[PDB]
Every structure is written in structure tokens, then in C-alpha cells.
Amino acid sequence: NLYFQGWQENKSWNAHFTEHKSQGVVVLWNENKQQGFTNNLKRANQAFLPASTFKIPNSLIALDLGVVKDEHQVFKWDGQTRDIATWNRDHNLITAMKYSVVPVYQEFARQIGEARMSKMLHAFDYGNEDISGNVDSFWLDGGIRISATEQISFLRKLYHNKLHVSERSQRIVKQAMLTEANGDYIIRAKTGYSTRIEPKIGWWVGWVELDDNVWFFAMNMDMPTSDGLGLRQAITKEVLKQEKIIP
Ligand SMILES: *C(=O)[C@@H]([C@@H]1N=C(C(=O)O)[C@H]([C@H]2CCCO2)S1)[C@@H](C)O
Numbered sequence: 623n624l625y626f627q628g629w630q631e632n633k634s635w636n637a638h639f640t641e642h643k644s645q646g647v648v649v650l651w652n653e654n655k656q657q658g659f660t661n662n663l664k665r666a667n668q669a670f671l672p673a674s675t676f677k678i679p680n681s682l683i684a685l686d687l688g689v690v691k692d693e694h695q696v697f698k699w700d701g702q703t704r705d706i707a708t709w710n711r712d713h714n715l716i717t718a719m720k721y722s723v724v725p726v727y728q729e730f731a732r733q734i735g736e737a738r739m740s741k742m743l744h745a746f747d748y749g750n751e752d753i754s755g756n757v758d759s760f761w762l763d764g765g766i767r768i769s770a771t772e773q774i775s776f777l778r779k780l781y782h783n784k785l786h787v788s789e790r791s792q793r794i795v796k797q798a799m800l801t802e803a804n805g806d807y808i809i810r811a812k813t814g815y816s817t818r819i820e821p822k823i824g825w826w827v828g829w830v831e832l833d834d835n836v837w838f839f840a841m842n843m844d845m846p847t848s849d850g851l852g853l854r855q856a857i858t859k860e861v862l863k864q865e866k867i868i869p
Pocket residue numbers: 672673674675722724762813814815816848851
């Protein structure tokens with residue numbers, strides 16, 4: 623039988639959003655204490671399109687089915703010129719995730735296919751597990767929905783290698799999730815920006831590795847234009863600093 627004390631609501635963190643003239647939620651989970659904290663318990667449980675944060679489960683499935691052989695395999699540019707310059711080149715899994723290269727992952731989705739994608743998402747217990755829409759864009763404008771607290775749940779399984787895919791697939795995706803590391807912490811995370819369907823939100827989900835603990839985080843925020851995308855990380859780090867998790 624699972625046990626859970628509940629999410630504590632700390633409305634103090636709301637200052638970090640209002641002082642940036644913004645609206646959103648940050649959710650934190652203390653792995654050692656098995657305690658969760660948020661500034662907004664309702665928005666914490668509100669489900670949105672995952673957008674580019676779907677690259678995490680998408681990468682795991684592609685690797686586990688052999689669609690992606692390893693983190694060095696090159697997915698060559700299809701020659702279509704797109705709005706994001708870094709997309710108009712060849713990529714491997716590391717760089718495709720760092721530059722959030724959508725057309726590489728849509729190709730992953732097509733090769734995975736509807737049937738296996740649905741079955742894997744059910745095995746992951748991922749969000750609402752609904753892939754209705756185009757096989758290669760349902761996480762951008764289809765039926766799939768996931769909340770900040772469901773993101774923590776999924777990430778916790780990935781951290782402990784508990785997802786129903788190979789340990790190796792999971793190690794590879796956690797490698798590709800690497801975002802920042804120094805003498806004080808490691809951050810493995812994925813950004814996201816949902817623009818195709820309202821409301822337009824930005825995501826940042828992942829976790830902070832310390833010497834003797836892991837803090838999982840999931841945040842999203844209203845994002846009416848791309849000028850505020852940097853706030854996804856800045857607001858989260860302000861909360862991490864306030865709680866003395868990072869210096
Ligand atoms: C993912 O959600 C989107 C890609 N991710 C980002 C991001 O910042 O996380 C890119 C931003 C950068 C300029 C505008 O989009 S795109 C994907 C769904 O487009």
C-alpha cells in the first residue's frame with residue numbers, strides 16, 4: 623500500500639511569478655523526505671499539452687524499440703528549412719533534445735506508430751494516456767494532457783529506472799536530459815512551449831541532483847509570447863534558491 627502525506631501549498635513562491643508579471647505554478651518534490659510542495663495546488667494538478675516535454679517519453683520509447691540505436695546515431699536533416707535555425711542540420715539524440723528538434727521526434731513518432739505509442743504511454747501511466755490526433759503531433763495539438771504533479775510521478779520512475787523499458791534506454795535519456803552541472807548540483811530537465819492550442823504555456827520539468835538528495839521539479843506558466851521563455855528557468859531557480867536547494 624502506497625502512502626503520501628500530501629502536497630503542501632506554499633503561496634510564498636507566488637512572489638516569484640508576480641514580480642515578473644507572470645502567472646504559473648512550480649511543483650517540487652523532496653525525494654528523501656517524500657514531501658511535495660507547490661505554490662498553487664489546483665494549477666499543480668491541471669493538465670496541459672506536454673509539448674516538447676514529450677521528448678522525454680518519446681525518446682525512451684524510440685530507444686527501447688530500436689527506432690534509435692544509441693545516442694550517436696545521426697538523423698539527417700530532411701532539407702526542409704524551418705523557423706528555428708538549429709533545426710536545419712543533422713542531429714543525434716543529445717543535440718535533438720538540447721535544441722528540441724521537433725521534426726526528428728515526429729519521425730520517431732511515425733516509426734513508433736499509433737499502436738505501440740499508446741501501449742507504452744499506458745505502461746508509463748503517462749498523463750491521460752490519450753494519443754488521439756495525428757500520430758506525429760498529438761503531443762502538440764491532440765488529446766494528450768499531463769499536469770505538473772503527473773510530470774513528477776513519471777520523472778520519479780525514470781530516475782529510479784522503474785519505467786517499463788530497458789535500464790539502458792532510461793540511462794540514455796537521463797544522459798540526454800543533462801542541462802547543467804557544477805560542483806554544487808546537476809540538473810536534468812526538459813523545456814517545453816505549447817503554442818498550437820490555447821492556453822499558450824511554457825514548461826520546465828526535471829530534477830536537481832545533490833550529493834545526498836534529489837529534488838524533482840515541474841513548472842508551467844502562461845506564456846503569451848516567446849519573449850518570456852527565459853522565465854521558465856529563472857523563476858524555477860529563484861524558488862530553488864529560496865528553498866536553499868541550489869546556492
Ligand atoms: C517544445 O515544446 C517546442 C520547442 N521547444 C522550445 C523550448 O524553448 O522549449 C523551442 C522554443 C524556442 C523558440 C520558440 O520555441 S521549440 C516545440 C513544441 O516547438
